[PDB]
Amino acid sequence: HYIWAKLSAYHIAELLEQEKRYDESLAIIEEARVIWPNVPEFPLKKANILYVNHQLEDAKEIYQSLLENAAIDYQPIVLYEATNFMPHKMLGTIYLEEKDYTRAMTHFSKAYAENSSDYGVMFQMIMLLSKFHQPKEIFAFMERHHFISSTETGLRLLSMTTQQGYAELSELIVQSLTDVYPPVAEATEVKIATIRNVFPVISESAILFGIKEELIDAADLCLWHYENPQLPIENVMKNSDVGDIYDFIFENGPRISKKRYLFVLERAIALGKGEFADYLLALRNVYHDSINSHIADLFFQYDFADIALDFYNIVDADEVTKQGYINLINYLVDADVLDEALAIAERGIDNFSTDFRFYLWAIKIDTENRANRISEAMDEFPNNRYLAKLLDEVTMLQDTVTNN
Amino acid sequence: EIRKLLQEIKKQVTTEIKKMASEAGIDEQTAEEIYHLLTEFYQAVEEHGGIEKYMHSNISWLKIELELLSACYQIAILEDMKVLDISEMLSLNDLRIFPKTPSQLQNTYYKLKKELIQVEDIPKNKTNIFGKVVP
């Protein structure tokens, strides 16, 4: 019943979680939940640890409990949004991942009402509105709810929309800003114009400022240089500690880290720069044959599944990534190929034995053995309540019809 | 009613226990069997070292622990108690009769009843993703 201890335990729980020692961290939380049941910051962390560990239904249960719980009178000790904004923000994020767009908007809206300055919920709402509505309608929404509180806020929003390819929205956003420094506006106009496949012409100072204001990165410069060789991109890139990227892509120079290559490729894929992307793909030979698994995931991410499949078809299964299994399982299930999908889900259990999603896919797919698939999952996840609720459903129905 | 009885049994771990069950409408013999099974388990937990030591050993379940689990579920089920309620009640979250989680108790009861395991000591234990050949 002392506040220094409750916070001490939290420093520890948080420290362990940051070191990705989630099992040790959840142990601290469950101990805390017993000693200090009113402190909501502990359950809020279980939910967050559970979220990243892909046990979304267990996280949902906790977040939902943080808002309006009748059993515990949650009184925060340091994070006073533990029972308001943060549960709404996560529930909105989960419901979005679950494609329940209506529920996602409801929580995202509530979270924005609580804290109106979180670029996280704004980015998500803007993207969620992109699912249905047109840019002029979305900009009306953002103006209506006062998203753009300041010029700096609008720029931070602008870095997001420009990288997503929202040319018209970005155009609406920047034009509504007042007294923007001309280098900043020029860089934004060029970025919007590049989305529209307009020939890029940008001043040397605008590039220089755009890098410093984190509105322009190496991928942008490479795309622009590829589109327009008259640009002074090499001198800028060499001085920006990314000269190697320029040398590799354009000057037959030595290899860059796989992460950097895929960075430039991802931007090309994201902006719909097919000519540039094909050119970049032509450079993959110097990497290991394993590089195609990563390219495959990249293409699948932006919903080029056919192109992604074509890469996955030529990758050694040893090199297919854990997300790749998850992509492939989802693809096959949509193609009504449950036999092959189950085989990969099973494979994921063998290779990635600690990833909740694979056991859940087996349970979803293997209908004949569902109860057994659930029991196997519980063996690996003995503190997951969703699995336990699933078994009782099957177990109660069987045990009622067989016994009577 | 049954939940209150099992608590007093665990506290002891002789004549008094049979009287507690009879008052709450529980068969004295079935209560007597649980008391022997629990004491044998708790002694067995020390025969394997300490409670913390046993939990970290490669042995997940004990035959005596498995005997006690199936004994406890049977007597509780006769009281129209739900499986999940027995799981939580016997687990670390309630009576701490078993050094196991509710998911663990309910799963192993499922394994016992569906005969997926016997009542013995249990231990803790150029090709595509598609399978075709990459030229």
Residue numbers in the entry:
A (entry chain A): 233 to 636
B (entry chain B): 5 to 17, 25 to 136, 152 to 161
From the paper:
GmaR forms an intermolecular complex with MogR and prevents MogR from binding to operator DNA, resulting in the derepression of flagellar transcription.
To visualize the GmaR–MogR interaction that is required for derepression of flagellar expression, a GmaR–MogR complex structure was determined by X-ray crystallography using the MogRD protein and an N-terminally truncated GmaR protein (GmaR231-637) that contains residues 231–637. In the GmaR–MogR complex, one polypeptide chain of GmaR interacts with one MogR chain, consistent with the 1:1 molar ratio observed by native PAGE and gel-filtration chromatography. In the GmaR–MogR complex structure, the intermolecular interaction between GmaR and MogR occurs in two spatially separated regions, antirepressive sites 1 and 2 (buried surface areas of ∼350 and ∼540 Å2, respectively). At antirepressive site 1, a small cavity in GmaR on the convex side in the middle of the antirepressor domain accommodates MogR residues 152–156 and 160 from the C-terminal coil structure. The hydrophobic side chains of the MogR I155 and F156 residues at the protrusion of the C-terminal coil structure are embedded into the hydrophobic cavity of GmaR. In the GmaR–MogR structure, GmaR residues from the α26 and α27 helices and their connecting loop make contacts with MogR main body residues at the H6 and H7 helices.
